[PDB]
């Protein structure tokens, strides 16, 4: 079991509640939990199946040098860029 953090924006309330079923809603769209790999994958299934037009980002603790791994669904002004395997995030301007 590892740590899981889910951040949502413009998601229908179905997904927000579904995430409230297993995670604690610390902030508006910021949910925290600690689940196994299977439960993580399930949460991700619900995220990709229930989210529409919204953007969600999921980040879990692993044993990489960074110490965590993340993946995203949807489009946002902050997009991840691969710098020689190291995943960072760039902020794009308007247009």
């Amino acid at each position: 079991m590892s740590m899981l953090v889910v951040v949502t924006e413009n998601v229908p309330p179905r997904l927000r509640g579904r995430l409230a079923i297993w995670l604690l809603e610390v902030r508006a769209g910021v949910y925290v939990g600690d689940v196994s790999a299977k439960i993580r994958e399930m949460i991700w299934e619900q995220i990709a199946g229930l989210a529409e037009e919204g953007n969600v980002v999921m980040a879990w603790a692993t044993n990489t040098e960074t110490g965590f791994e993340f993946q995203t669904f949807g489009l946002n002004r902050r997009t991840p860029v691969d710098l020689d395997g190291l995943r960072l995030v760039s902020f794009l301007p308007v247009g």
Binding site: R14, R16, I21, L23, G49
Partner: protein
Amino acid sequence: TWLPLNPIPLKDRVSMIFLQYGQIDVIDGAFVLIDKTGIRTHIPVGSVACIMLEPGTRVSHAAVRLAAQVGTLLVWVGEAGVRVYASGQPGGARSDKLLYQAKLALDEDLRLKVVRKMFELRFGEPAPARRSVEQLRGIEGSRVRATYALLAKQYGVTWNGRRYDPKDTINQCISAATSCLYGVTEAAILAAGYAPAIGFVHTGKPLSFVYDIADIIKFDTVVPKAFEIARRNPGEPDREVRLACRDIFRSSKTLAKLIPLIEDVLAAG
């Protein structure tokens, strides 16, 4: 946008949650506890094995449906958290395991084998030979009293006798502690698809088997720890006891060791 909501394993779940003095509603698919003032407390019903409801709660239909689908046992408790009522998934029982448990319960010889297995797994020593269920229950009562006197002397608690009817604090703590152990224990059995009423040493009661399983380990960790709380005599014992039990249920990983143990007991068949 309708995906099957499946429950999560019992060992990978939080112990217990207590709610009081507020209505339980389903908001956008989520277990919500609203207070008289209107403050919404989102509860992670999926990642908790058992939710214990204190007096003052008003549960809704969709709330019990939701708690049922995620495999979360709802336990209405009363004074000192003693279980008054319970609700759960009615079809969440395994045919093979029910028929196995009941097959071991019907025959008197297999029933005696299961009782002996419970005695040995509890005290670490085999039961006396050629002894009936009532005699093993009497010896069990004597050993229980000796454990109450031994814990009373170890932790220094003024002891005068075991009193179930609330009509001191120590007993209350025990009743709380053991109560919690009963609660989670029942959930395990439900998660294991057995029946809670089909007992071997205890009979007739709707949770007899539960009382058996808990009685294997109650004095191993739960009862002495309860004594600890009594040693301090706090102002809000119950809550603290609850916390302590939770920590014990973590430190011993009880939720993970119950199902094998139960199986081990039935392995005496």
